[PDB]
Amino acid sequence: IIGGEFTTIENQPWFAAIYRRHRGGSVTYVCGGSLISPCWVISATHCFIDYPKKEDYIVYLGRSRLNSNTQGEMKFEVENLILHKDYSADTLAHHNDIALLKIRSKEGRCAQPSRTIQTIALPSMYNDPQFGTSCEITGFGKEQSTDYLYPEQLKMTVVKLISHRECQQPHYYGSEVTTKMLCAADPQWKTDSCQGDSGGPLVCSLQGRMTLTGIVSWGRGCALKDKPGVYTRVSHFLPWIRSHTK
Numbered sequence: 072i073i074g075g076e077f078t079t080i081e082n083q084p085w086f087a088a089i090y091r092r093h094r095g096g097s098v099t100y101v102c103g104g105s106l107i108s109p110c111w112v113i114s115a116t117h118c119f120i121d122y123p124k125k126e127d128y129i130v131y132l133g134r135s136r137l138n139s140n141t142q143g144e145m146k147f148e149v150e151n152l153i154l155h156k157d158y159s160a161d162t163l164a165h166h167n168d169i170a171l172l173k174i175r176s177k178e179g180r181c182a183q184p185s186r187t188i189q190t191i192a193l194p195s196m197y198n199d200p201q202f203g204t205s206c207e208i209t210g211f212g213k214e215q216s217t218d219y220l221y222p223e224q225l226k227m228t229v230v231k232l233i234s235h236r237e238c239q240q241p242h243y244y245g246s247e248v249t250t251k252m253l254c255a256a257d258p259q260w261k262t263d264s265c266q267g268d269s270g271g272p273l274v275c276s277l278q279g280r281m282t283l284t285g286i287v288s289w290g291r292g293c294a295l296k297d298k299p300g301v302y303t304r305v306s307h308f309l310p311w312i313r314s315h316t317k
C-alpha cells in the first residue's frame with residue numbers, strides 16, 4: 072500500500088495473510104485474502120498460477136504483522152486450491168483473476184469467528200457502488216515501487232471508484248480494462264495498492280452494509296497518474312463463487 076495509514080487486524084478482521092513454503096524450509100509472503108465463510112478464503116489466481124501446489128501455502132487469520140504471531144491469530148493449510156479455469160494474463164490486464172482457498176487447521180477445523188477473525192459479506196448481483204464512492208483497501212504490499220521489502224505492519228488506505236468509460240480512456244488503460252474489472256484510485260495519485268497487495272480486499276460501504284466489492288488484481292506501476300488500480304469485480308463472479316463453495 073502506497074501512502075495511507077498503518078492498521079491492525081481488528082480494523083480488517085476478514086483480511087487473510089497468505090504465505091508459501093519453499094523447498095528448504097524458508098517461508099515468504101505471497102498475497103492478501105478475504106474470509107467470505109469460515110472454510111473459504113477468496114484471493115487472485117495470478118498469486119498461485121505459477122505454483123499451484125496447495126501443500127506449499129500457509130493461510131493466517133487475525134494476523135496484524137508480517138513476522139509476528141499476533142494474539143488470537145489462527146494458522147491454516149489449504150485443503151482445496153481452486154483457480155479460475157479461464158484465467159489469463161496480458162501485458163497489463165489479468166483476466167478472471169479470482170481464486171478460492173478452502174482453509175483447514177491441523178485439527179481439521181475451519182475458522183473460529185472472534186473479535187479479530189470475521190467474514191466479509193459478498194455483494195449482490197448488478198448492485199455495485201457508483202463512481203466516486205470511497206472504498207478501503209488492505210495489504211502487506213510495497214510502500215514504494217522502488218522498495219523490494221514489504222512493510223512489517225498491516226496497511227490500509229481509501230481510494231475512489233472510477234467508471235468504466237473513464238478507465239477506458241487512451242491515457243488510462245483503453246480497451247485493456249473490461250466490464251468484468253473495476254478501477255479505483257486517488258484523484259491526486261498519492262495513495263494506491265501495489266505489488267504484494269494482490270488478492271487483497273476492496274471493501275465498499277453500500278447502503279449501510281460493508282461488502283467485498285473488489286480483489287486487488289493489476290495496474291500500470293503504483294500510484295501513477297492516469298493509471299488506477301484494477302480490481303476483480305466480485306459481483307460478476309457470484310455464480311462462480313457459489314458453485315465452487317457448495
Ligand SMILES: N=C(N)c1ccc2ccccc2c1
Nearest residue numbers: 264265266288289290292300
Ligand atoms: N496500481 C496498482 N494498484 C497495482 C495493483 C496490483 C499490482 C500487482 C503487481 C504489481 C503492481 C500492481 C499495482
